Amino acid sequence: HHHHHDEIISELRELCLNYIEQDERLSRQKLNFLGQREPRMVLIEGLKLLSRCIEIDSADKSGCTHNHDDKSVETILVESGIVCPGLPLIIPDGYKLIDNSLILLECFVRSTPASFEKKFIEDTNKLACIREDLAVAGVTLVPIVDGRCDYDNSFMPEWANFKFRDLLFKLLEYSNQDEKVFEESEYFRLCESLKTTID
Amino acid sequence: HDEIISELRELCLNYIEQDERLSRQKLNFLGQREPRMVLIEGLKLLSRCIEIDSADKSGCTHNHDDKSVETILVESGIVCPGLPLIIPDGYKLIDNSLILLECFVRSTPASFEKKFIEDTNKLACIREDLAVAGVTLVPIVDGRCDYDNSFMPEWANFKFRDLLFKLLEYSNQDEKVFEESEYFRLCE
Ligand SMILES: [Mg+2]
Ligand SMILES: [Mg+2]
């Protein structure tokens, strides 16, 4: 056809344009993904695009607002006239305030039972350790941890999701040769000689 | 053809500032393959830039979702049914006054004045039914003479329009030199 890497990139863009549902909360990340032309960058922003699908998909199913702009909890409450300072820097995947209860959502994907459970406890405990600062605000914390075992989500048909991840794999397991060829360049050796001059 | 669609793609991606209000329209534009659709979305995209500048100059919110006056009010708690389907380029409900913004581009004084009166009458004919509901209409018509907007350098703005223009003149294909020579010759 062929499939030399620039055509992989091309097929990823067609998948993004033809088979990722046109939800406004993906517009920004779709645009950042379509804007890339270097292979490791296309790979990075493709992975970030697929993660936004899962996070937003999670926020919808959990009945709160996807944290579109990665606000902190302190920011979410400071945005609603509720002064709570002295709280960890926590950025939830979703949130929703009612009337004095604050739903906070963390979601994730793990592929083995051991890592699933371990991750579930970690995010449970991350949310639990601010329950009391919120109590003196005084707002009730409603922690939600949404663990998933795969990458299915409602903005991608399953076949396109799989083909997208499959092209991403070919893109990584290829640009894992361009950086290896890079380590024999000279510009690599000239980088190597660049640090010794500053460090 | 394709190199025109390709360099248009790169202007959109690299030389239109990444204000998120443009994101959706940029993406509809980037998804078009055929000249006709590239042209309409191209023009819509230039218009969105201009509407968004107007909203920002006029102190009101850009009508991103193409909401209706009907909708804008019910979202602020004003039940006022029976209004014609009017969809502004901008809006801002403020106390009990509804700022409605109509934004446009024209390039001759004659067609500028015409389109100005039209958008004036467009909003004015819902003034009374807003007064029934309490809200006083604040109608703003902002007409422009060109496509200058704050999201593109001027050279890019010109190159985009020059590229869209060549799609427009391409849509020709002689064609009319064979009209009756088979077409107007069917129900004959
Ligand atoms: Mg309009
Ligand atoms: Mg208008």
Residue numbers in the entry:
A (entry chain B): -4 to 194
B (entry chain A): 0 to 187
Q: What do the study authors state?
A:
The crystal structure of the LCMV endonuclease domain (ENDO) was originally determined some time ago, but in this original structure the catalytic ions necessary to fully understand the mode of action of the endonuclease were missing. Therefore, for this structural study to be successful it was critical to search for new crystallization conditions that would allow the molecules to form ionic complexes. The present ENDO-WT structure clearly shows the two Mg2+ ions directly coordinated by the catalytic Asp88 and, through a network of water molecules, by Glu101 and Lys114. From our observation of 100 crystals during the screening and analysis of work performed on the Lassa virus endonuclease domain, this coordination event seems to be rare. On the other hand, if we compare these results with the structure of the Lassa virus endonuclease domain reported by Reguera et al., we can see that the coordination of the two Mn2+ ions involved the corresponding residues Asp89, Glu102 and Lys115, a residue from the asymmetric unit (Glu3) and no waters. Together, these data indicate that the affinity of the Arenaviridae endonuclease for its catalytic ions is low and that the metal-ion binding at the catalytic site is the result of a random event in the absence of an RNA substrate. In the ENDO-WT structure, the water molecules mimic the positions of the nonbridged O atoms of the RNA phosphodiester backbone involved in binding to the ions. Therefore, we propose that in the case of the LCMV endonuclease domain the RNA substrate is a necessary contributor to the formation of a transitioning ion-binding/catalytic site that allows a two-metal-ion catalytic mechanism (TMIC). Our data show that the presence of ions in the holo structure is in fact a rare event. The structures show that the metal-ion binding depends on the number of water molecules that are able to create a mesh of interaction around the ions. This suggests that the catalytic ions responsible for the two-metal-ion catalysis reaction are most likely brought in by the RNA substrate itself.
The endonuclease domain is at the N-terminus of the L protein, a multifunctional protein that includes the RNA-dependent RNA polymerase. The synthesis of mRNA in arenaviruses is a process that is primed by capped nucleotides that are ‘stolen’ from the cellular mRNA by the endonuclease domain in cooperation with other domains of the L protein. The L protein cleaves and snatches the native cellular mRNA cap structure through its endonuclease domain after ∼11 nucleotides, and uses it as a primer sequence for the RdRp domain of the L protein to synthesize the viral mRNA. The catalytic centre of the ENDO resides in the N-terminal part around Asp88 and should contain two Mg2+ (or Mn2+) ions, which are critical for the RNA-cleavage mechanism.
